[PDB]
């Protein structure tokens, strides 16, 4: 028997079997409904669409994400995503073998309970576990001492880990993510007189951000350079074949992680939260945390973000500390690679919450047995 691993994002869901090295199923965790009157009759069309369906047909649809900021906002949509995951794409009977689920730290307590309840009652999974995303990235990157900057859609967080001990008081969560970069990118795009007003082109803005955006190694000199000449401008075809051309704006969007004042967010950027998370640790371990500083999740994929991170923490690190950034190319998948290897450890097999224990205890078992 083999466990299922499904890393559940806030825009993208990644699933497969344990001991696989890359997930078999990846699709956007997106649900769509038709917003129009039908003309034809005898078409046999179906009510609502999931994932690559709702990507393909998006111009006909309205698209909703059931997860925002790592909180499952509507269970009645999410259950469709899981039903598509297990039955349609994987071709698996989830009643046969256990499942592992991944979650951002410090999110609402009820989220775990209700996800457990749905797993045991609806899917009848034989055993279940949930793991903090930032832990798995250390399994994936091969380390036992780490500080982890994990960002996707919905959530960013830092979690320090030293030789297999977490440091709960030092967890930093920060609600800034690719969705908030995208919403800001729409407004900055409007400055050049392109206007994107509904979800079906929000899905285009996301792709523009993915291909074209990049992080200035120092912002204001390059801001001046791009104002001074068109050399940094680059262009993109919309679906209709309109070329659109974008300049200083393409670095200006992914910067805002480092200056959340642009979004009107109160907190400091990811560099200052990473530093404060280290400094909340005690001094015996800080020297080792400075070397084991690990990028994870898709929002870290922007070119330059490692160099900008290394420079901007170096300016805060005491100069003897040779701080080092680890940014492997897989890292968009690293959380899943970690859940894959964790679920395959023999030592883990004790750890699962079995249905016997759930029926004995009810959903509150999760807080007790899990992290």
């Amino acid at each position: 028997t083999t466990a299922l691993v499904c890393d559940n994002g806030s825009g993208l869901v990644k699933a497969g079997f344990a001991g696989d090295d890359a997930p078999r199923a990846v699709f956007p965790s997106i649900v769509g409904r038709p917003r129009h009157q039908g003309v034809m009759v005898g078409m046999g069309q179906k009510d609502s669409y999931v994932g690559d369906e709702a990507q393909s047909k998006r111009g006909i649809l309205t698209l909703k994400y059931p997860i925002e900021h790592g909180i499952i906002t509507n269970w009645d949509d999410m259950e469709k995503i899981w039903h598509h995951t297990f039955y349609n794409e994987l071709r698996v009977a989830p009643e046969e073998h256990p499942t592992l689920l991944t979650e951002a730290p410090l999110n609402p307590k009820a989220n775990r309970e209700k996800m457990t309840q749905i797993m045991f009652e609806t899917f009848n999974v034989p055993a279940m576990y949930v793991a903090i995303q930032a832990v798995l990235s250390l399994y994936a990157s091969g380390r036992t001492t780490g500080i982890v900057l994990d960002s996707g859609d919905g959530v960013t967080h830092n979690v320090p880990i030293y030789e297999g001990y977490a440091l709960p008081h030092a967890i930093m969560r920060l609600d800034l993510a690719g969705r908030d970069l995208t919403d800001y990118l729409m407004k900055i795009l409007t400055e050049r007189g392109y206007s994107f007003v509904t979800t079906a082109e929000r899905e285009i803005v996301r792709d523009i951000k993915e291909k074209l955006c990049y992080v200035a190694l120092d912002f204001e000199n390059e801001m001046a350079t791009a104002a001074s000449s068109s050399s940094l401008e680059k262009s993109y075809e919309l679906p209709d074949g309109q070329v659109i051309t974008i300049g200083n704006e393409r670095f200006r969007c992914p910067e805002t992680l480092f200056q959340p004042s642009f979004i009107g967010m109160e907190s400091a950027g990811i560099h200052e939260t990473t530093y404060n998370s280290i400094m909340k640790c005690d001094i015996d371990i800080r020297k080792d945390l400075y070397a084991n500083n690990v990028m994870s999740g898709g929002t870290t994929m922007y070119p330059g973000i490692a160099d900008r991170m290394q420079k901007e923490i170096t300016a805060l690190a005491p100069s003897t500390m040779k701080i080092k950034i680890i940014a492997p190319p897989e890292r968009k998948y690293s959380v899943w690679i970690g859940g894959s290897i964790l679920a395959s450890l023999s030592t883990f097999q004790q750890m699962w919450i079995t249905k016997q224990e759930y029926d004995e205890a009810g959903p509150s078992i999760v807080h007790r047995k899990c992290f």
């Binding site: 925002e68 900021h69 909180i71 906002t73 609402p108 609600d175």
Partner: peptide, 7 residues
């Protein structure tokens, strides 16, 4: 969420 934010 339930308070300080849309979720």
């Amino acid at each position: 969420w339930x308070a300080x934010c849309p979720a």
